[PDB]
Amino acid sequence: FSETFLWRLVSVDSEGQNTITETVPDTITKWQGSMFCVSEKEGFGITKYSANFTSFLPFFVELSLPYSLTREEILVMKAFVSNYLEECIKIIVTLQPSADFEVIPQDVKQDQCICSGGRSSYSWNIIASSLGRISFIVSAETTHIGASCDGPSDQSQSTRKDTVIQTILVQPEGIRKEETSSNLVCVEDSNVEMPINLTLPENIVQGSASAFVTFVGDVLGLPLSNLQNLLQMPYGCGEQ
């Protein structure tokens, strides 16, 4: 969905290359492309400035969302509706609720007329019910009316509405605590076994706990990348 656009390598056929790549429906904002080349005769090559592509719709909704939080805490999701289309038309929104959270509006669910360049917004007061992954799905749709702020509210065609799905994560509520156990087990060319006891207290938040095991050895760590530089002819003052 959205972290990069492209990362690859191709050879050349006497002109370069016209690579064809799909476009992500997550055309959020502009995209920077840079590349490199090498030739066995006249050398290496880079850009002057990166090819900066862009793509979007004149009318849509951008969302303002936070990083992460805990379940019991509330927040206020927000989203601008933005128009670049010339005509001034009334718009409304659709939201998908889910049990992983609770939502309270601000009591103004008003479809509204926005003109060219104009923007409005709406927000939702959200608490959480699940933990971990959280997603929200909404859609901006055009409303039809003839006697509007200015003439009929044009409706374009079937794809007059767009859907957006965006995800963050939510964390456990209280105070976190970690414990560990250790064992240097050294086996002389044989088999050695050990059970593992991991018991936890009672009042812990449900599902909060998570356990994991690590396997290292030591001393063999960095005795090689250290030798090549710790030797030199001593010159200077006597003490140093």
Partner: protein, 96 residues
């Protein structure tokens, strides 16, 4: 073919006597393997199957990276450029 520093000296001879004078000169940080990329065109809708045509040497194998721009704006980019690499090049020339 000329590094950003160029050492030019002009000289001549007068029997037992010589003359010579030199100066270093500034050159742009340019390479030879020209390369040109183009999406055609920009600002469209989510137009998948979009094309990026590029031109370079007729014999070559090489690579490409297209990424976001918000990171570009926010964080101090490592200047991965001919400038930096040529600067990293050692023994470009010697004083004395």
């Amino acid at each position: 073919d000329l590094a950003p520093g160029a050492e030019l000296i002009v000289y001549c001879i007068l029997d037992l006597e010589l003359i010579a004078d030199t100066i270093s000169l500034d050159i742009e940080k340019c390479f030879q393997n020209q390369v040109s990329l183009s999406f055609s065109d920009d600002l469209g809708p989510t137009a998948s199957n979009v094309s990026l045509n590029l031109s370079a040497a007729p014999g070559s194998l090489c690579g490409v990276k297209v990424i976001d721009s918000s990171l570009l704006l926010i964080n101090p980019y490592e200047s991965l450029s001919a400038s930096g690499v040529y600067y990293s090049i050692p023994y470009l020339s010697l004083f004395g």
